[PDB]
Amino acid sequence: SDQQLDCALDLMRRLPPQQIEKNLSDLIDLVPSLCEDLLSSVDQPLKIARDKVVGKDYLLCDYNRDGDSYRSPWSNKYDPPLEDGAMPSARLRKLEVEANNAFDQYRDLYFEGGVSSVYLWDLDHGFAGVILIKKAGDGSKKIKGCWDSIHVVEVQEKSSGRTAHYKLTSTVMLWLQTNKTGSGTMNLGGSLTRQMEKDETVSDSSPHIANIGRLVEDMENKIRSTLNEIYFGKTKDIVNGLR
């Protein structure tokens, strides 16, 4: 059991990253005891749902789940309907709507498409939030790809609200596929997880969302360069050392 957790995590690091969902399904089917422990440690590609009140897409994770229902960031309603589903406070929901709008613009500026969603919840000495971004590359028989990123941020306030400590845990899941005549079929698949702690001043001009925004932006920019130049470039050098 506890040792099987070590083996299941190891097996996920070695199986092809483009089949995370199918592998976790087959892995949990093999050992049902780990159904709870796997999903808590390995991130899955995000699924999309349509808000039925205002007709906008939003992304599903455990943080916006309650039972078998998911809460929409747009209408703040559960789907399937829940009479008494977990809601954020009025104060935090206001923040949540501003964070969704801000990262929506962020998504549009860096991704030019896809879907983004933000969910906040309260902690004893602050609040936490998730930022989810999904961008699929569809519309070509020969060139395919998909980006999924998940950002878990923890906010702790101090100095009577003038400074705050931000803890950020980010995972990017990326795959690319080209089918060309010279290079045949090429599949590149990756996942990268990184963390970042930081103190930032909280003011009228530098509010929590601006701090979280700059934090997520720097992390995704850094993870994109790392995936490209350190990790994908390394596999290229390995290819040129095989022959």
Partner: peptide
């Protein structure tokens, strides 16, 4: 390295996918 913040409290249901 360091742990992720605790999830929202008072939530029914166990974890699942899709």
């Amino acid at each position: 390295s360091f742990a992720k913040p605790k999830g929202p409290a008072g939530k029914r249901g166990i974890r699942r996918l899709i």
